[PDB]
């Protein structure tokens, strides 16, 4: 966290800084998207 | 016309020779998108001046 890294989560590849988010996703929701349709946030499959 | 708009997906799925086909489609269109933007900005640039 707090560093730019190359992350692969559930087959989703990308480069970005990982930080803790206050947005609460419903139990069924998985990956969010911003106005640009790019990934807004992700979810660690092991530790939710 | 590409299978997916994400470049990482094209590289993580297709082989190197097959990925070039899908990447070329995305680049070609994104070039036209930039040409459209600059074209409009140049027109508006003459109006503001």
Curated annotation (Swiss-Prot), chain A:
Highest taxon, organism lineage: Viruses
Role: Attaches the virion to the cell membrane by interacting with host receptor, initiating the infection. The major receptor is host ACE2. When S2/S2' has been cleaved, binding to the receptor triggers direct fusion at the cell membrane. When S2/S2' has not been cleaved, binding to the receptor results in internalization of the virus by endocytosis using host TFRC and GRM2 and leading to fusion of the virion membrane with the host endosomal membrane. Alternatively, may use NRP1/NRP2 and integrin as entry receptors.
Quaternary structure and interacting proteins, as annotated: Binds to host ACE2. RBD also interacts with the N-linked glycan on 'Asn-90' of ACE2. Cleavage of S generates a polybasic C-terminal sequence on S1 that binds to host Neuropilin-1 (NRP1) and Neuropilin-2 (NRP2) receptors. Interacts with host integrin alpha-5/beta-1 (ITGA5:ITGB1) and with ACE2 in complex with integrin alpha-5/beta-1 (ITGA5:ITGB1). May interact via cytoplasmic c-terminus with M protein. May interact (via N-terminus) with host bilirubin and biliverdin, thereby preventing antibody binding to the SARS-CoV-2 spike NTD via an allosteric mechanism.
Identification of the protein by name: Spike protein S1
Classification lineage: Viruses, Riboviria, Orthornavirae, Pisuviricota, Pisoniviricetes
Gene: S
Complete-protein stretch covered: 535 to 582 of 1273
């Amino acid at each position: 966290k707090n560093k730019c890294v190359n992350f692969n989560f559930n087959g989703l590849t990308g480069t970005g800084v990982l930080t803790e988010s206050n947005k609460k996703f419903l139990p069924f929701q998985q990956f969010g998207r911003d106005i640009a349709d790019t990934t807004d946030a992700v979810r660690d499959p092991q530790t939710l | 016309g590409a299978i997916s708009s994400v470049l990482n997906d094209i590289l993580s799925r297709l082989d190197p020779p097959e990925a070039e086909v899908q990447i070329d489609r995305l680049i070609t269109g994104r070039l036209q998108s930039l040409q459209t933007y600059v074209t409009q900005q140049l027109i508006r640039a003459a109006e503001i001046r």
